[PDB]
Amino acid sequence: LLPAFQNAERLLLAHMMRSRDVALVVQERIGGRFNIEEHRALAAYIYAFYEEGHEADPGALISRIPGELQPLASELSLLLIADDVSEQELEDYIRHVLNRPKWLMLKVKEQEKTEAERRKDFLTAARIAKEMIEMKKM
C-alpha cells in the first residue's frame, strides 16, 4: 500500500493551489529536489504558471496540467487542507522530501554491511551499523 511518500507530497501542492505566501517559500526549499519521477513533471506548470503573474486559486489549477498527469491533479486537492497553514506543518514536508535522498544511502550501507557479510566478514561490518544508526535521527 501507500507508505509515507504517498501521503506527504500531494496536498502541499494543494495548499499552494490557492494563494501566494503559501506557494512562495517552496521552490527555494524544493529546487528541486522532487522525489518521485513525475512529481517533477507537473512542477513545470506549478511554478512557471505564477511566474507569468497570475492571481490565485485552483479553479484553472485543477488540470493544466496536460493528460496522464491529470488522474491525480484532480484527486490532489480533494481532502482536508485547512488553509490556516500550520507553522508546525512547516519544516516537515521539505525535510521529509529533502532528506529522503539523504536517507536513501541506508538502502545502501546496510547493503554493503550485508554484502561483505555472507562472503565472510561481519564484525567490522558490526561497525557499519554505528554509522547507520546515527543518520536515522533526521
Binding site: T114, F122, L123, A126, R127, A129, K130, I133
Partner: peptide, 28 residues
C-alpha cells in the same frame, strides 16, 4: 560500546545462535 560485545560473541561459542547479526542489529 556496540562492538565490545559483538566480537566477544564470535569468540566464546555464540554468533549464529541468534540468526546472524541481522537481529543483533534489530536489538537496537
Amino acid at each position: 560500546d556496540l562492538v565490545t560485545v559483538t566480537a566477544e560473541l564470535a569468540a566464546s561459542e555464540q554468533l549464529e545462535e541468534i540468526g546472524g547479526v541481522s537481529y543483533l542489529s534489530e536489538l537496537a
